[PDB]
């Protein structure tokens, strides 16, 4: 009976997160089989719900992307009766996840000290902009602001050009991945000790840690980084090249690969040229070498280059737009297009799970919940509320229930 | 109880190279796992030769992502080397590799071979595009993957050539996926008592990260475009040039927009019909950004940081490497981590992103030298006597560093 079972099956997660960093972490935990309870404000809900267009039905595409495999309960945390519901859920929930500014939930009585009293077992994870404490800890967390402060924006952009930001909020997504792993570490710690712990995850720490070798260049060698566009500082040639109909990324990491690229480009003279004999020589003569290579790539179409580079064994790929990405058979074969049946919106498609496991499949996923969709169900079953009290909560406005259950 | 780490007592057999794999095992090493790093004798990990910057004989690239590990140099191509890996796998909980799909299977180190001897083992494979597929045989590279996955297409200046992120965020994202996924396997193994196979690849990680942007095309049939530092739906929310640098300032509602306008001493803009609402501000984006940009250039970045203090609106400065680690918050978070390398001396690398209440990860073992723990691992983990170790050393199957 244990042949085909998900790892986080039987783990209840109380999710109070909003926007992207938090929901992406709980979504990936939901794929692993955990039961995720999403707490939202009555009427408005998660901020992403209003982030449209694009709007499909009454649901924004932003919200649907990162909120699958969750159940929604609408509770007014500011009301004292709402605080009681959250505490009661915490008693039966293994994990507590929030992404408010430090001290906000504590001011409302939902802080870790408050939750620990009723749920000492609970794994409390807090996602913030800059951390629980510090001089700038009170500032709210924003992806673009954090990438600027953390220094990623400084090193991203065209050479001798203005800084740019990554297209998607990679700082937010990286923090969500840090937390998604950290929460599982808390569960492993919980099994041994029998007690819960507090987790601190923040955008600043996530992005700085990702700087890795680039930051180590300054910490150890006192070397300041610069923007390189699509090129690499230490490897030449390794950049995107403009073509007749698009861009192609071609790289050579050694003389064997460089000779292969030159032959495909019909430029054998470069192989034995003294300026390009070695990688260090190629880096020193980067400006001249790139100009010669760029002239060749422009002469032919991207499709012809992909045909010529087939089986080359060197790094090579095309810059793909959204239409081209999901046209790729490899993307489809990996299951990256995930389709789910939304109760009121119909069939919808979002990016699928990145990770695939041999023992179990995560292809079948629950669609993102409507605002307050499971409010009455969670109260009646999980908290054993009678119908009379639920109606009183509904009339007062403490909780909100959607038309569709 | 302090000094109690979650993954303490978990042995990880690490055959990864470059960045994606080592970043995953490094974070597992911080959590208390015993990470055994298998490297080629003579050459070692590819990152070792990726210098300058070089400190001593170790590249800064290698040192950044290889702390909290032990190094054993084994020749997997030799049949005697294959036996050593199999013996280690029997006593190791986790097996991690990042070779091209099918390469280890040819050498006898594939999942089927390891599963027979170590059914408990958790096997994690990190590849460019996945275990199977039309382009699965292609090797994994960050710049190539970001181009194919579509991240490069949406990153860059508006009406400008595409650019790539400064760091290999696709590789690091995949490493973060694996580090979480490996722990998911351990939790499942505790219940079932048997191991499983994990597939992690750069393409799947980056595409999944596209998230709402990909959902716009999949659901709304909308094609994305490059926005520089600006945002498509929110104006103003971008980096602004200053007298000495760049500052990022954003306003998400009319109240925040009024706050920004007052700080910039442009109150007339608040009540202007062209900028009354966010939708109106988006429509007149070109005109509004020009007016705001002219004001930002007049003053120094530090003056703006002083004026925006306590404003409550999104605001931050673009920091270079010197400014990042100059920030007190970065130091307060423990992000500067120092360890004592035996031959290189005291060194500093970026610290762990996550901090836990029960245990501390501040003290870390320094990155190992090539083949530093070869004799120790063979003698202790596999109970090899001195006689057998010498025979492997003479043949060249294993390599031991001068420093132990």
UniProtKB/Swiss-Prot annotation, chain A:
Disulfide bonds: none annotated. InterPro entries: CoA-transferase_III_domain (IPR050483), CoA-Trfase_fam_III (IPR003673), CoA-Trfase_III_dom3_sf (IPR044855), CoA-Trfase_III_dom_1_sf (IPR023606). Its main location: mitochondrion. Keywords: Acetylation, Disease variant, Glutaricaciduria, Mitochondrion, Transferase, Transit peptide. Inhibited by valsartan and losartan carboxylate. The keyword Transferase applies. GO terms for cellular component: mitochondrion. It comes from the Eukaryota. It catalyses: glutarate + succinyl-CoA = glutaryl-CoA + succinate; 3-hydroxy-3-methylglutarate + succinyl-CoA = (3S)-3-hydroxy-3-methylglutaryl-CoA + succinate; 3-hydroxy-3-methylglutarate + glutaryl-CoA = (3S)-3-hydroxy-3-methylglutaryl-CoA + glutarate; hexanedioate + glutaryl-CoA = hexanedioyl-CoA + glutarate. Its EC number is 2.8.3.-, 2.8.3.13. PANTHER family: SUCCINATE--HYDROXYMETHYLGLUTARATE COA-TRANSFERASE (PTHR48207:SF3). It is linked to Glutaric aciduria 3: An autosomal recessive metabolic condition characterized by urinary excretion of abnormal quantities of glutaric acid, in the presence of normal 3-hydroxyglutarate, glutarylcarnitine and glutarylglycine urinary levels. Affected individuals show no consistent clinical phenotype and many are asymptomatic. Belongs to the CoA-transferase III family. Coenzyme A (CoA) transferase that reversibly catalyzes the transfer of a CoA moiety from a dicarboxyl-CoA to a dicarboxylate in a metabolite recycling process. Displays preference for succinyl-CoA and glutarate-CoA as dicarboxyl-CoA donors and glutarate, succinate, adipate/hexanedioate, itaconate and 3-hydroxy-3-methylglutarate as dicarboxylate acceptors. Acts on intermediates or end products of lysine and tryptophan degradation pathway, in particular catalyzes succinyl-CoA-dependent reesterification of free glutarate into glutaryl-CoA to prevent renal excretion of glutarate. This is Succinyl-CoA:glutarate CoA-transferase. The gene is SUGCT.
